[PDB]
Design a protein around this ligand. Structure first.
Ligand SMILES: CN[C@@H]1CCc2c(ccc(O)c2O)[C@H]1O
Lengths: 231, 281, 329, 50
């Protein structure tokens, strides 16, 4: 009879209403991904943001979701994350001297190259964090491992006068940190749908949440501007 | 000879408007990937331009070519009402599109919640309701008619049917249709340009080692240079002046008309729209 | 050490070369072509939020199950278009889905490493865990046994009540991305990120045969209805049809125009048509015996991610990243 | 390790000529061709979707 059809239509209407409510709840939530090395210190960034592992935090009444995929050398799950607003990349800037039986920083550079030139995620920006800045400063000041020993490009490298450094009270650590940043920046610029946003951060610092908020806002603004052809 | 030549231009304008707006509406409706929050406003603008180009442009061309209006007085009033409704709806939808763009750019986090399909439908319904009010209510109720002897003679005459309006109605129609949307559009586009310049400066500083000006320039030009002269002549001729001849008024009105055919080729320049048009044709 | 392995590989290569007398195309050159096929979108479901990942027709030719990145598993009635059920998933990401032949259970698992199973008579009856990596595909042998493909390069055979891995089919280099079952429950095969695609026996638990013979990244596998052959889709533009009895390749479906890989592969009821979804927005069909394309299906907004042909052969359902499931007949 | 034993087990298996397998597949496709609604014509009334 038609009673079964009427009941099925009622169930469909209820499910559609619930789906609309869920869509309203979900379209306002922004997804982020943590992609950092084991020694990169992603745990410190996770702790700073909180203050598969899913972390939810709300900034200015805007909800965020942060997913960490946790060896997996052949990353095939990366194509799943195509709707995320940005990809949070964490690389230990003090791990230049550390060697894997290829420097760890060079491995991170190769990982960044693989992520940037990915066919599936071509409109996904990257938020870059460089933890262990204090450790990098200590390593550069000590001079036990020369920055030019593993990176020959430091021979002709010069500090960029345009970039105003923080009051680190030492030109050497500033030059090293800016070289490390410029490597990633050149790798990203070698490819304008998505952008790279470097940041110098320390484990003590807790202002990373506002940095992520502002950077995601700028990412959405740039996406809209390019969609409307104003940039 | 001049009338024969004028017929070709009017026919070409009508055909261009109809073809462009029909193509835009078909592209928006046929493909489900094109449907979006802003594409609802785009298709409302396309519908308004299509109805105006189909209704008033051919009839205005017939009136100007034959120098006489064969149909009845009621049909002339209906044609004038349809013309005013369509122009008001088109310009109001341009203003609404600009407002939506400004809200999406300067308020990105709150844009998703602020604008939805229900909200877009409500906004479009409100725009069309206010346009229908401003058009039909003061026309079908004989509010716009003037007290001049010439106006009364023209209204009583069956064949000749020109446009004669009160100062009050002319001012109100102008401010409702063009002037307020002009101010809102200029403000929102100035804010959008400031945001774009800030973003360009930041991107230049960070990466190290324009387009927004050109786009806003073409949009503001094809809006202003098309509508502003007619909507300043309206107020001039209504407000204590006789230097506005009929030829100037009609020429500026027809420039405002051809603005409708100019709009779709600039408001549907997106690569997705181009791909949809290629698939359709 | 490796000398024995090299000798064994040479022996199997020689055996395969000796056994290949006349290729499939040589025999099939005297067969009538299928001809042009017109496939129309009979019904579009369009009840999803985010990109969907996998689907599975029910034992009955009506019901559907689709899993999306939105984390919602919605059961769809193809005939009526009404949504029978909507079971949310604890994990936001669901890499696959499955409909049991009984119809009383539906399994969905993803990056959570847990092959959650829902009872339809919608609560999680039991969640099966123990995989080091993410899941890729799940199939129901019966109402009490389910085989899952994991990112830890292992495939497992579970028991619902016990909740423990009855057998582990180890011995694979790359991560398995898709598996298919034989018409009977005895045999099932899977293809990994490595080009190797191996056949397995659920009882013995050993890889009886290993074909490989592909470029890289096999992403989809289906069984020929007869069960003697299975076709593998890969990230390479080609799609190949293997053979269990001959233990080697039979035909390769490649075209110059196509440069993208494969995402889902499924045969027709008679096995004459090999429908294969692509990273391009449109799916393609192939003459399984003539190796000639018959007709390109209509495209979606984004890439397709799944294929399914009804047990009755009524229609084929394709679901893309555009959150739309388009039933085709 | 166990890879050598697995390869040795895989090598020792009975195989049939590929011509026989191709002929068997062609025979199956020819015999069950009428059953498939996709390949064969589909009546307007038979089609549940239209
Ligand atoms: C057919 N001529 C009409 C007369 C006055 C008028 C027009 C357009 C928009 C308005 O807001 C108006 O008040 C013209 O198109």
């Amino acid at each position: 009879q038609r009673n079964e059809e009427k009941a099925q239509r009622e169930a469909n209407k209820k499910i559609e209403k619930q789906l609309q409510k869920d869509k309203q709840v979900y379209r306002a939530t922004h997804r982020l991904l943590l992609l950092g090395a084991g020694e990169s210190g992603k745990s410190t960034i996770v702790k700073q943001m909180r203050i598969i592992f899913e972390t939810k935090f709300q900034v200015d009444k805007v909800n965020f979701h942060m997913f960490d995929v946790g060896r997996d050398e052949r990353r095939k799950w990366i194509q799943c994350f195509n709707d995320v607003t940005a990809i949070i990349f964490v690389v230990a800037s003090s791990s230049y001297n550390m060697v894997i039986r290829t420097n760890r920083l060079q491995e991170a550079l190769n990982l960044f190259k693989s992520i940037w030139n990915n066919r599936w995620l071509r409109t996904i920006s990257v938020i870059l964090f460089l933890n262990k800045q204090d450790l990098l400063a200590e390593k550069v000041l000590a001079g036990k491992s020369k920055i030019e020993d593993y990176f020959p490009e430091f021979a002709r490298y010069t500090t960029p006068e345009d970039a105003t450094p923080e009051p680190g009270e030492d030109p050497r650590v500033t030059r090293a940190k800016y070289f490390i940043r410029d490597e990633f920046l050149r790798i990203s610029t070698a490819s304008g749908r998505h952008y790279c946003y470097p940041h110098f951060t320390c484990a003590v610092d807790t202002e990373n949440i506002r940095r992520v908020f502002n950077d995601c806002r700028d990412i959405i603004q740039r996406m809209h501007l390019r969609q409307y052809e104003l940039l | 000879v001049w009338v024969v030549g004028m017929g070709i231009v009017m026919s070409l304008i009508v055909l261009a408007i109809v073809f462009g707006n029909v193509l835009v509406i078909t592209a928006i409706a046929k493909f489900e990937r094109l449907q979006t929050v802003t594409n609802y406003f785009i298709t409302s603008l396309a519908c308004a331009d299509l109805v105006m180009g189909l209704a008033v442009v051919p009839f205005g061309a017939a009136h100007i070519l034959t120098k006489t209006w064969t149909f009845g007085n009621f049909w002339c009033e209906f044609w004038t009402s349809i013309d005013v409704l369509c122009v008001t709806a088109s310009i109001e939808t341009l203003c609404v599109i600009a407002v939506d763009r400004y809200f999406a750019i300067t308020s990105p986090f709150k844009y998703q919640s602020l604008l939805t399909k229900n909200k877009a439908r409500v906004i479009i319904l409100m725009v069309w309701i206010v346009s229908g009010l401003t058009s039909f209510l003061p026309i079908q109720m004989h509010w716009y008619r003037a007290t001049h002897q010439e106006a009364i003679n023209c209204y009583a005459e069956e064949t000749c049917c020109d446009f004669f309006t009160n100062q009050a109605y002319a001012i109100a129609s102008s401010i409702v249709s063009f002037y307020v949307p002009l101010v809102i559009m200029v403000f929102v586009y100035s804010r959008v340009f400031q945001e774009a310049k800030r973003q360009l400066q930041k991107i230049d500083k960070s990466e190290g080692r324009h387009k927004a000006l050109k786009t806003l320039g073409i949009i503001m030009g094809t809006f202003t240079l098309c509508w502003l002269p007619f909507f300043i002549v309206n107020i001039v001729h209504v407000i204590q002046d006789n230097l506005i001849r009929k030829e100037v008024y009609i020429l500026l009105n027809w420039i405002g008309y051809v603005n409708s055919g100019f709009n779709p080729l600039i408001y549907c320049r997106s690569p997705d729209f181009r791909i949809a048009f290629q698939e359709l044709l | 050490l490796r000398q024995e392995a090299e000798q064994l590989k040479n022996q199997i290569r020689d055996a395969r070369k000796a056994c290949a007398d006349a290729t499939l195309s040589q025999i099939t050159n005297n067969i009538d072509p299928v001809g042009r096929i017109q496939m129309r979108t009979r019904r579009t479901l369009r009840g999803h939020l985010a990109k969907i990942y996998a689907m599975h027709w029910g034992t009955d030719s009506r019901l559907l199950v689709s899993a999306s990145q939105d984390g919602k598993l919605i059961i769809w009635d193809s005939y009526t278009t009404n949504k029978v059920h909507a079971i949310p998933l604890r994990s936001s990401w669901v890499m696959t889905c499955a409909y049991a032949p009984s119809g009383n259970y539906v399994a969905c698992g993803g990056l959570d490493n847990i092959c959650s199973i829902y009872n339809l008579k919608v609560r999680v009856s039991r969640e099966l865990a123990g995989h080091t990596g993410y899941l890729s595909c799940c199939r129901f042998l019966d109402d009490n046994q389910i085989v899952t493909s994991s990112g830890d390069t292992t495939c497992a055979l579970w028991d619902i009540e016990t909740g423990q891995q009855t057998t582990t089919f180890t011995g694979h280099t790359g991560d398995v991305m898709s598996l298919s079952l034989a018409p009977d429950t005895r045999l099932f095969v899977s293809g990994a990120c490595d080009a190797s695609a191996k056949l397995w026996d659920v009882r013995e638990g050993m890889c009886r045969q290993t074909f490989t013979g592909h470029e890289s990244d096999i992403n989809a596998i289906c069984f020929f209805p007869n069960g003697n052959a299975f076709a593998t889709g890969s990230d390479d533009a080609t799609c190949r049809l293997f053979d269990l009895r001959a233990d080697q390749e039979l035909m390769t479906y490649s075209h110059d125009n196509i440069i993208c890989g494969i995402t889902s592969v499924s045969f027709s009821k008679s096995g004459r048509l090999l429908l294969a979804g692509y990273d391009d927005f449109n799916c393609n069909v192939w003459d399984a015996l003539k190796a000639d394309r018959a007709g390109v299906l209509a495209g979606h907004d984004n890439r397709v991610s799944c294929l399914g042909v009804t047990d009755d052969g009524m229609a084929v359902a394709t679901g893309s990243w555009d959150s739309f499931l388009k039933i085709w007949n | 390790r166990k890879l050598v034993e697995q390869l040795k087990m895989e090598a020792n298996i009975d195989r049939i000529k590929v011509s026989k397998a191709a002929a068997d597949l062609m025979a199956y496709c020819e015999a069950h061709a009428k059953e498939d609604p996709l390949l064969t014509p589909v009546p307007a009334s038979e089609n549940p979707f239209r």
